[PDB]
Amino acid sequence: KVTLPDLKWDFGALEPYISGQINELHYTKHHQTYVNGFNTAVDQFQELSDLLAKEPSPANARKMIAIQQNIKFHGGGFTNHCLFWENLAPESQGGGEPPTGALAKAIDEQFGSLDELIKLTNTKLAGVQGSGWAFIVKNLSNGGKLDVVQTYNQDTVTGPLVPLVAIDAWEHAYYLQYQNKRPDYFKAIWNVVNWKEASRRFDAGK
Amino acid sequence: KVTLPDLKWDFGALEPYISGQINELHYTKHHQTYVNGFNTAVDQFQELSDLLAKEPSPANARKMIAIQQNIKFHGGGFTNHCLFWENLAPESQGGGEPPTGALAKAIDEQFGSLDELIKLTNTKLAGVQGSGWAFIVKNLSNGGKLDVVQTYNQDTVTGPLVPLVAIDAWEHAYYLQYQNKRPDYFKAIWNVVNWKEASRRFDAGKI
Amino acid sequence: KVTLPDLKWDFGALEPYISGQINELHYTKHHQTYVNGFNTAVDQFQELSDLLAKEPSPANARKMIAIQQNIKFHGGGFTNHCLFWENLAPESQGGGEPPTGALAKAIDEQFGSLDELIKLTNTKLAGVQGSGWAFIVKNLSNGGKLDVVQTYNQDTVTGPLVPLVAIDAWEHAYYLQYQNKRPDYFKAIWNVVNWKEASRRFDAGKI
Amino acid sequence: KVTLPDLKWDFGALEPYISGQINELHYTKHHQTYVNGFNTAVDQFQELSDLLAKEPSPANARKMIAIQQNIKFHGGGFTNHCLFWENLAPESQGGGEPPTGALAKAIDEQFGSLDELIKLTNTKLAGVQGSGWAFIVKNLSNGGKLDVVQTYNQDTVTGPLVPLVAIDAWEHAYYLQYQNKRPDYFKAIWNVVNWKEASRRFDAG
Ligand SMILES: [Mn+2]
Numbered sequence: 001k002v003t004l005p006d007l008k009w010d011f012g013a014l015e016p017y018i019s020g021q022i023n024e025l026h027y028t029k030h031h032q033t034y035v036n037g038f039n040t041a042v043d044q045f046q047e048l049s050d051l052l053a054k055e056p057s058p059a060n061a062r063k064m065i066a067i068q069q070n071i072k073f074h075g076g077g078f079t080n081h082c083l084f085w086e087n088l089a090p091e092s093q094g095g096g097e098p099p100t101g102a103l104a105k106a107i108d109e110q111f112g113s114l115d116e117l118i119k120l121t122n123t124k125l126a127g128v129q130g131s132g133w134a135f136i137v138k139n140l141s142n143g144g145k146l147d148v149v150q151t152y153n154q155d156t157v158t159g160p161l162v163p164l165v166a167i168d169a170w171e172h173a174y175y176l177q178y179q180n181k182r183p184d185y186f187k188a189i190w191n192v193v194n195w196k197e198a199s200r201r202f203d204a205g206k
Numbered sequence: 207k208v209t210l211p212d213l214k215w216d217f218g219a220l221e222p223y224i225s226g227q228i229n230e231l232h233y234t235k236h237h238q239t240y241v242n243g244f245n246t247a248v249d250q251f252q253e254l255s256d257l258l259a260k261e262p263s264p265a266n267a268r269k270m271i272a273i274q275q276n277i278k279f280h281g282g283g284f285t286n287h288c289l290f291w292e293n294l295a296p297e298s299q300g301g302g303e304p305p306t307g308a309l310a311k312a313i314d315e316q317f318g319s320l321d322e323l324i325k326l327t328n329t330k331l332a333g334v335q336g337s338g339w340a341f342i343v344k345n346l347s348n349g350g351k352l353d354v355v356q357t358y359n360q361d362t363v364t365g366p367l368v369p370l371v372a373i374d375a376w377e378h379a380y381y382l383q384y385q386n387k388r389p390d391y392f393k394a395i396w397n398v399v400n401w402k403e404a405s406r407r408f409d410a411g412k413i
Numbered sequence: 414k415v416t417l418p419d420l421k422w423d424f425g426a427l428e429p430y431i432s433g434q435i436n437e438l439h440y441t442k443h444h445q446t447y448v449n450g451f452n453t454a455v456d457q458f459q460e461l462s463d464l465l466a467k468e469p470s471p472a473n474a475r476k477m478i479a480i481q482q483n484i485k486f487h488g489g490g491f492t493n494h495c496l497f498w499e500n501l502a503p504e505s506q507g508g509g510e511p512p513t514g515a516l517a518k519a520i521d522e523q524f525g526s527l528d529e530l531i532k533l534t535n536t537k538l539a540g541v542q543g544s545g546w547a548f549i550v551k552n553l554s555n556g557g558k559l560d561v562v563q564t565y566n567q568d569t570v571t572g573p574l575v576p577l578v579a580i581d582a583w584e585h586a587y588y589l590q591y592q593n594k595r596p597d598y599f600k601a602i603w604n605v606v607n608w609k610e611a612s613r614r615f616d617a618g619k620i
Numbered sequence: 621k622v623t624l625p626d627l628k629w630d631f632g633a634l635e636p637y638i639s640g641q642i643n644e645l646h647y648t649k650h651h652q653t654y655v656n657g658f659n660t661a662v663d664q665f666q667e668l669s670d671l672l673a674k675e676p677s678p679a680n681a682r683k684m685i686a687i688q689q690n691i692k693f694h695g696g697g698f699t700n701h702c703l704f705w706e707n708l709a710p711e712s713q714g715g716g717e718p719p720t721g722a723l724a725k726a727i728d729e730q731f732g733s734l735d736e737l738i739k740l741t742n743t744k745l746a747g748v749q750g751s752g753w754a755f756i757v758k759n760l761s762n763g764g765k766l767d768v769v770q771t772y773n774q775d776t777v778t779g780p781l782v783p784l785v786a787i788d789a790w791e792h793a794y795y796l797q798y799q800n801k802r803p804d805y806f807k808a809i810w811n812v813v814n815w816k817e818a819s820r821r822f823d824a825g
């Protein structure tokens with residue numbers, strides 16, 4: 001059974017970049033919905049697995065096929081938002097401060113500068129044509145190199161792709177404050193990105 | 207734990223429309239792979255579920271997300287092939303004979319004739335751009351009306367879309383015999399379609 | 414060059430069901446974005462098509478492939494919103510009034526009642542996991558039968574699936590008024606659905 | 621108008637790794653189908669484009685949406701196969717010989733060895749659940765770093781992802797020789813991969 005994670009900051013601590021009203025809805029309603037949906041999906045899979053074991057029919061296999069979509073969607077919603085809150089922080093907790101150490105070295109070597117990486121990520125965010133996410137990732141399969149990837153809906157990065165910074169591009173992440181002005185949101189959010197957490201994720205490779 | 211279903215006919219019973227060599231590989235290799243993959247994926251889900259209950263971390267949920275794809279793909283492969291074998295039959299067992307009862311009525315009313323429904327299905331099959339399936343379905347949500355739908359890979363028809371006839375359009379379903387000539391396969395298969403099973407599925411409104 | 418369509422109603426005319434604030438942003442900003450993106454994509458097509466004629470290389474075909482997604486997405490956004498505005502009307506212009514003629518007959522025959530069709534549509538809307546649309550359609554391939562289809566992003570219904578009622582499920586269609594309470598929006602919108610236009614589309618069997 | 625490209629080798633030249641029977645069908649039938657489909661789709665879109673200029677209706681935009689699917693699929697089929705023939709070669713033309721220069725240095729730095737990159741690519745190929753491709757790519761957006769990406773159907777790599785080696789995982793690429801033994805085909809194909817072409821693509825970007 002999963003639950004909402006503890007936040008490291010108060011709902012209004014990311015103002016003026018992200019409003020307290022958005023954070024409260026985003027956490028208490030949206031993230032909670034994924035929590036509930038994931039727990040439900042996993043319970044349903046347990047029931048269907050037990051059913052399939054005693055009656056291993058195509059009919060019962062078809063029922064299991066039907067709920068894996070919910071496990072993927074709600075599981076992704078649960079995990080993506082957990083990553084998101086952990087890579088946000090108010091300026092008083094280091095939000096917006098550049099990364100140091102090995103991550104900073106890799107960023108300059110690969111993208112030239114942090115600003116160039118941020119600009120690339122904002123282009124990737126703008127290019128999400130629907131609901132989705134951008135992630136700055138470390139790829140463990142190609143020698144640990146940085147990349148920026150897009151996902152749709154609540155799809156996430158798995159396997160050798162370790163998420164370092166997750167940025168939510170669903171309209172509920174910004175609409176109450178920015179309405180249609182999504183580039184203003186993508187620009188603003190970097191002021192409260194926690195690069196210390198990004199560096200930790202980079203160093204651990206988890 | 208799932209297993210290969212019993213066949214209602216021998217591998218060579220659908221000759222010359224579908225070769226015995228294809229049926230043998232299709233069943234003993236391809237369908238078996240989905241059986242194994244599905245069993246493995248469900249066991250893996252179980253293992254991860256037990257772990258999540260003790261450590262409900264985002265990291266463990268992430269692992270479960272990865273396994274979902276395999277449950278979907280192999281579960282689909284298992285289910286779709288089971289449907290496929292059950293809607294094929296040699297002529298001696300009624301393969302190629304038209305449906306009767308309520309299904310026959312519905313077909314003429316919606317498509318004009320069985321031949322027109324078959325033509326539409328062959329167009330849908332030709333339109334699969336990659337691996338996939340076409341299904342003649344009964345839609346329980348719109349008053350039980352017939353339709354033809356396409357799926358990709360091992361996606362299948364679920365919920366209110368009840369499969370009546372499943373036709374495999376993966377290249378392994380025909381390539382050894384027809385090579386690139388996929389429309390020849392799509393034309394040929396109707397000679398061994400089991401419309402009695404289709405009628406049964408239509409009446410039952412379920413698998 | 415495509416442009417924003419004329420609206421048949423004032424921005425605030427669908428209140429209380431959809432706020433004037435939402436309609437104004439939805440039309441002047443969101444729909445405009447798709448108009449701009451589609452015009453840009455088509456111009457880019459033309460440039461690349463000309464280039465390909467002179468230099469029919471894989472590299473140039475690769476550039477053409479890259480632009481296809483923008484044509485699809487923005488084309489869909491343009492088309493879907495045009496459909497949407499035309500199937501909404503204030504109560505004073507008949508919004509919420511049931512369809513008549515051949516469409517009303519089809520609805521009762523397939524769904525039992527208009528209420529049952531609306532409930533199905535709301536379930537399909539609720540099932541959109543991300544941004545998307547639901548469409549009540551007439552399927553020209555199966556004898557003209559009604560159905561409800563979901564799409565994601567700005568995917569749309571093409572070919573034999575003729576849209577009769579389009580309902581937008583993107584968060585921008587409701588969030589300023591309803592926030593997370595998407596089912597309340599899906600319930601409310603029917604009060605301003607223009608079933609006369611749905612009937613017109615049903616009879617025409619085209620856009 | 622696109623056409624089938626010239627091959628640099630005879631149909632049977634890749635035996636015993638890929639049969640002449642397969643190459644002949646794969647080129648003269650399958651690739652030709654994509655050539656024809658792409659030409660048809662581009663012509664259709666041009667007609668619709670000229671029409672939209674005079675009648676910029678939702679009805680006409682809807683027709684254009686329908687055609688783009690064929691542009692993507694057949695365009696991908698056309699380009700992916702062009703890449704494929706150019707990154708295959710018989711042993712007599714250097715097939716199977718390791719890359720050199722900058723590409724070889726990048727491979728060792730990122731993957732440890734060519735063998736390790738090949739093993740990774742084979743895992744990516746094995747993971748294609750349906751028809752599709754694996755590509756070894758140079759990513760121009762992250763400093764030119766190598767990666768391996770999977771695509772489905774005739775989807776391809778575009779923009780900053782430069783294809784260096786394309787490997788076809790559609791069943792028609794192997795079934796006549798390997799039938800269900802897809803992993804054996806993935807293992808075998810490296811004996812006729814043209815890494816000289818891969819190195820050229822890497823250096824050019
Ligand atoms: Mn969110």
Ligand SMILES: [Mn+2]
Nearest residue numbers: 236374376379
């Ligand atoms: Mn099959």
Ligand SMILES: [Mn+2]
Nearest residue numbers: 443581583586
């Ligand atoms: Mn909209």
Ligand SMILES: [Mn+2]
Nearest residue numbers: 650788790793
């Ligand atoms: Mn091929």
